[PDB]
């Protein structure tokens, strides 16, 4: 209820994560930035080839790559 | 295709063997580049004749099969074995949108068409027979000169105009790698008579398309410039070329790699 | 055989003038595809041209789809484009009959079929600027190692002559001038006539003018927004001709909104 | 996840009720194909004594319950009761 | 016996499905998405090239390649 009447100071809201419904082990970064990175990327894919697409697309790409290297250190086996 | 029939001979027993499935393949396809020939028919008709004597042998079959209809058995095996309606059940459910699925009911599909899955059934014997697996792995005796000196050059040059007409390249191996057993020197070579040096170009031969490669050259320490120079070295010397005429031949070989080259533009 | 169906004056005046009530129109675009064919290449028989025909229509059936630019871009683009190294390529033993079809039939809606209907491999990232060239390695190395040489390019005008189609668009109107002034000359009175005899400025700016509303009507089909409620007062293709439609007694526009700023552009 | 493509296999005789991969759904048709071809309208299987390790015969009971429920197939148990309850 | 009279608007019943008449570490919904791939395949075969026949299967391809692709997570063990 209280989402429904927020999408209309602009706010957007993503849909609610519920860890009740996720695999048991998976971090919640991962589960958030896959809600998160769908949006944002369907957003751009809304453009349809434009100048604006290529510029944001590939800093976005950067920005989630150099974070994949954390994405293996929310904890594991053993270091190497 | 590189090797001359004459060449190939030499030192070998009167009678080589090789598997019952390696022969009846041998035998249909014989037929396929021969009975085109106007001359060589002779072999044709005797490989067709004695194939459908084979084929009895092997898929223990009672009725009647033709030369046709073993050509058909035979071009539906490049299929995969696990498509649906050629192994598996043909009424199972179908799998989730993989890049195989495209594959798999490819050849299910048209195995269903064309009304006739007469040469299917074969095939699934050719497959999946306890016999007919058995049968094939069984050797059998084959004559050194089946075919006449002739007659397996008509086959080579066969191949030639159907893979220059495609266009598709052949990587040559090093000429430092005694590996073949079969020639006496550097000079008798395969590949020489694939850049048509007169003395070793048999004729009626269609030029290919020849890149360079050293990927086993058989000796301690080579390189791609070492295998260059070797086969500069004998044009010059045993086949007596200028070194300009004898440059481009090599040349030849060693921009056929550029051409058909791998490498993204 | 399949050009026909996409250039052809006298199937357009069947379409363009025929309400979109009915439907079935199988027997209008068979008669009027063999006096298209009559007149563009009169040397043909008639008995080759009916089997032709006779075949393109069954050979669409078994395929279980209906007579439409959606079934015939789909024959046109698996016959003559195949993927290849650099993408979508045209086969090299078709090439030269391929070029004709471009005489008489653009590449930019054969292009975007092949790509729906067969991707590139892996879903390979695709921007199409250039037209299809066939693929052969032996050129290929040539043109790479040693450049091309052009000694005759007229820069005025438009890089090619599709995306002039699209210019056109951008002056509905301001075209319609040089159609005009154009047509004073005796020789434009001539040449516009041996295409369609009925060719008129008013037409001109008549089929310009629909052009433009069906590109509009069909993009809110392919952004996926929902109709947009005033195309139940239309059925007759004329009513496109005002760039304004009659519903209920009110005013009805036809443009939309595009995600691009340049809604009229190649990409 | 590369095993269910090979699931989801059919059942392609009598076609039962059931679709799948249970194990049950395969094992009729193969009991009754196997009765015609024997002569026989049914199969006598014995399970011996399990007196010594009664452990063992858990399997056995599962065995029992989840596979050994066609009509066509009659099988003899034996033991004590009493160590089945335990 | 209920799956009986719905059988005699329309309404479908799956078949009875019992998990300790399965293997012990094969989900459920693996399970019920076998036989419910079991009706829909059967009557796609029934159409075998009718009308829209195409249209039907090719939608229900993608449809089990996407529920695929999130059927290794349930399963899996731990987040890799």
């Known amino acids: 209820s209280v989402v429904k009447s927020l999408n209309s100071v602009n706010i957007k809201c993503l849909p609610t994560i519920d860890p009740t419904k996720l695999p048991r082990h998976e971090p919640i970064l991962v589960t958030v930035t896959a809600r998160l990175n769908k949006m944002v990327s369907d957003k751009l894919k809304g453009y349809w080839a434009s100048n604006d697409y290529r510029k944001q697309k590939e800093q976005w790409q950067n920005h989630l790559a150099q974070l994949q290297r954390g994405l293996h250190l929310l904890t594991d086996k053993e270091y190497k | 295709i590189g090797i001359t029939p004459s060449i190939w001979k030499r030192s070998l027993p009167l009678s080589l063997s090789m598997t019952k499935e390696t022969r009846l393949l041998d035998l249909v396809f014989i037929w396929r580049e021969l009975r085109s020939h106007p001359e060589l028919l002779r072999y044709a008709s005797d490989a067709a004749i004695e194939a459908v004597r084979l084929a009895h042998k092997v898929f223990s079959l009672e009725e009647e099969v033709s030369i046709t209809t073993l050509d058909q058995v035979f071009e539906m095996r490049g299929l995969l074995a696990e498509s649906e309606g050629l192994l598996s059940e043909l009424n199972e459910p179908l799998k989730p949108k993989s890049l195989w699925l495209e594959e798999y009911e490819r050849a299910r599909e048209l195995v269903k068409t064309t009304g006739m899955k007469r040469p299917l059934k074969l095939y699934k014997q050719w497959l999946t027979s306890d016999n007919v697996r058995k049968q094939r792995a069984e050797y059998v005796e084959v004559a050194l000169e089946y075919l006449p000196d002739e007659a397996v050059v008509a086959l080579q040059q066969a191949v030639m105009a159907k893979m220059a007409d495609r266009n598709i390249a052949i990587e040559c191996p090093p000429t430092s790698n005694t590996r073949i057993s079969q020639y006496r020197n550097v000079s008798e070579h395969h590949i020489f008579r694939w850049m048509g040096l007169p003395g070793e170009a048999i004729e009626g031969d269609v030029p290919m398309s020849i890149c360079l490669g050293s990927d086993d050259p058989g000796i301690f320490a080579a390189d791609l410039k070492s295998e260059f120079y070797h086969l500069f070295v004998v044009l010059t010397r045993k086949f007596g070329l200028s070194p300009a005429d004898a440059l481009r031949k090599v040349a030849e070989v060693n921009e056929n790699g550029r051409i058909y080259r791998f490498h993204d533009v | 055989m399949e050009r026909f169906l996409l250039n052809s004056t006298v199937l357009l005046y069947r379409l363009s003038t025929v309400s979109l009530d009915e439907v079935s129109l199988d027997e209008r675009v068979e008669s009027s595809v063999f006096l298209a064919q009559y007149e563009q290449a009169r040397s043909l028989p008639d008995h080759v041209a009916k089997s032709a025909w006779s075949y393109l229509v069954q050979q669409i059936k078994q395929r279980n789809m209906k007579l439409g630019p959606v079934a015939i871009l789909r024959l046109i683009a698996e016959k003559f484009i195949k993927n290849e190294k650099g993408g979508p390529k045209i086969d090299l033993p078709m090439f030269s009959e391929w070029q004709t079809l471009m005489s008489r039939v653009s590449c930019l809606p054969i292009i975007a079929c092949h790509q729906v209907f067969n991707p590139g491999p892996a879903s390979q990232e695709y921007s199409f600027r250039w037209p299809l060239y066939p693929y052969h390695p032996t050129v290929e190395d040539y043109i790479t190692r040693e450049c091309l040489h052009e000694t005759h390019q007229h820069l005025n005008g438009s890089t090619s002559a599709e995306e002039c189609w699209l210019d056109a668009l951008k002056h509905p109107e301001a075209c319609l001038r040089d159609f005009e002034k154009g047509w004073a000359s005796q020789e434009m009175k001539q040449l516009c006539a041996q295409i369609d005899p009925s060719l008129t400025p008013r037409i001109f700016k008549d089929r310009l003018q629909i052009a433009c509303n069906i590109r509009e009507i069909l993009c809110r089909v392919a952004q996926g927004v929902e109709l947009p409620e005033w195309i139940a007062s239309m059925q007759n293709p004329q009513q496109l001709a005002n760039s304004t439609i009659l519903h209920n007694g009110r005013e009805y526009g036809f443009a939309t909104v595009w995600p691009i700023d340049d809604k009229y552009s190649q990409e | ?86």
Do not use: H, M
Request: glycine residues 4%; negative net charge.
């Open chain 4, 1 to 86: 996840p590369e095993y269910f493509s090979d699931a989801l296999k059919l059942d392609a005789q009598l076609d039962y009720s059931i679709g799948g991969q249970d194990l049950s759904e395969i094992f009729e048709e193969l009991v009754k194909r196997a009765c015609e071809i024997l002569d026989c309208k049914a199969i006598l299987i014995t399970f011996d004594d399990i007196d010594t390790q009664f452990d063992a015969g858990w399997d056995v009971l599962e065995s029992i319950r989840k596979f050994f429920n066609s009509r066509k197939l009659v099988v003899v148990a034996t033991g004590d009761l009493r160590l089945y309850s335990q």
